[PDB]
Amino acid sequence: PQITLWQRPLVTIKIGGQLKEALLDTGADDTVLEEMNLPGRWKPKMIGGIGGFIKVRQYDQILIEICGHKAIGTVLVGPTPVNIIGRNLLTQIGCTLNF
Amino acid sequence: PQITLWQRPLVTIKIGGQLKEALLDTGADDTVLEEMNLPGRWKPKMIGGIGGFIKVRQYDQILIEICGHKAIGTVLVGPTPVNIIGRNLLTQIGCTLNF
Ligand SMILES: CC(C)(C)OC(=O)N[C@@H](Cc1ccccc1)C(=O)C[C@@H](Cc1ccccc1)C(=O)N[C@@H](CCC(N)=O)C(=O)N[C@@H](Cc1ccccc1)C(N)=O
């Protein structure tokens, strides 16, 4: 699809059997989701943006679907204000910026 | 152009006659630049990211070029970690996401 930017680019993702709304975010290196359970081991991580840093849990090799496109990647979980799909996963679904 | 997301989508902008690097950021509603001097009146704004809210100065009707594309719009100035080109300007230059 071609998604315009008149409004926030929110899409439906599928992860851990749950469906969620997340923001396609080219300014995000990583994918960060609100608190949720995921399987496997994890390690702590600090991520920063406008406003400073928050502490998240890093889960590796997690299957995710973004608008029907399947991918695998690292997913961070913590107190993010909104669900963010970052560059680590945008690449996998073939997402580019065009103008 | 077409910009892939394997690295940050950093571009050259020009504002106040000077060249700066900035991030094409679909996850940002607004454009926020690092501390600098701009002409005219400003108004206050609070904007929120990953780690909380920061105070910034809003300037309207500012000339800014993004990859040589001329734009005139609102530019926020404050303690942001990096120069960010947000949707307000990405729309002016005709930027979409595609996959
Ligand atoms: C991986 C990680 C998630 C940490 O990356 C980022 O945070 N990247 C930065 C851009 C950035 C990149 C690199 C360094 C610093 C910042 C952005 O792309 C994140 C995005 C996504 C996000 C959205 C809401 C809450 C948290 C995050 C972000 O911060 N957007 C902000 C950008 C600033 C702005 N005013 O445009 C945004 O749209 N804010 C809006 C909306 C808002 C209001 C209140 C509370 C929250 C949001 C605003 N006007 O504040």
B25 to A26: CB separation less than 8 angstroms, yes or no: yes
Q: Could you tell me which residues are beta bridge partners of residue B46? A: B55
- A93 CB neighbours in chain B (<8 A) are 99
Cα A61 to Cα A80, A89, B47, distances in angstroms: 20, 11, 33
Q: Which residues, in sequence order, are CB contacts of B62 under 8 Å at separation 6+?
A: B15, B38, B72, B73, B74, B75
Cβ A62 vs Cβ A38: under 8 Å: yes
Report CA-CA distances (Å) from B17 to A53, B31, B62, B65, B88: 33, 18, 12, 10, 21
Q: Which of B49, B50, B96 sits opposite A3 (nearest CB)?
A: B96
Type of residue at B81: P
Catalytic residue among B25, B29, B30, B60: B25
CA distance B29 to chain A (A): 7
**Per-residue H/E/C for A29-55:** CCCEECCCCCCCCCEEEEEEECCEEEE
Residues forming a β-bridge with A56 = A45
Count of CA atoms in the C-beta half-sphere (13 A) of B97: 28
Which DSSP state fits A16? Answer: T
Residue A78 CA: distances (Å) to CA of A35, A45, A60? 5, 10, 15
Residue B43 token pair: 């108004």
Instruction: Give which of A4, A1, A67, A71 is closest to A31, Cα–Cα.
Output: A71
Q: Report the residue of chain B nearest A69, measured CA to CA.
A: B99
Note if A25 is an active site residue. Answer: yes
Interchain CB contact of A84 with B (< 8 Å): yes
Q: Which residue of A has its CA nearest to B78?
A: A50
Closest protein CA for atom 22 of ligand 1: B49
Of A50, A84, A95, the CB nearest to B99: A95
- Residues spanned by the domain of A74: 1-99
Residues whose CB falls within 8 Å of the CB of residue A17, separated by 6 or more in sequence, listed in order: none
Helix (H, G, I), strand (E, B) or coil at B93: helix
Look at strands A43-49 and A52-66 and give their pairing: antiparallel
Using what technique was this structure determined? X-ray
Question: CATH number of the domain that A40 lies in?
Answer: 2.40.70.10
Count how many domains chain B has.
1
Q: What is the pairing mode between strands B43-49 and B52-66?
A: antiparallel
Q: Cβ–Cβ contacts within 10 Å for residue B75, how many?
A: 27
Element (H, E) at B94: none
**Which two tokens mark A84?**
């963010």
DSSP collapsed to 3 states, A48-61: EECCEEEEEEEEEE
**A5/B87 Cα distance (integer angstroms):** 6
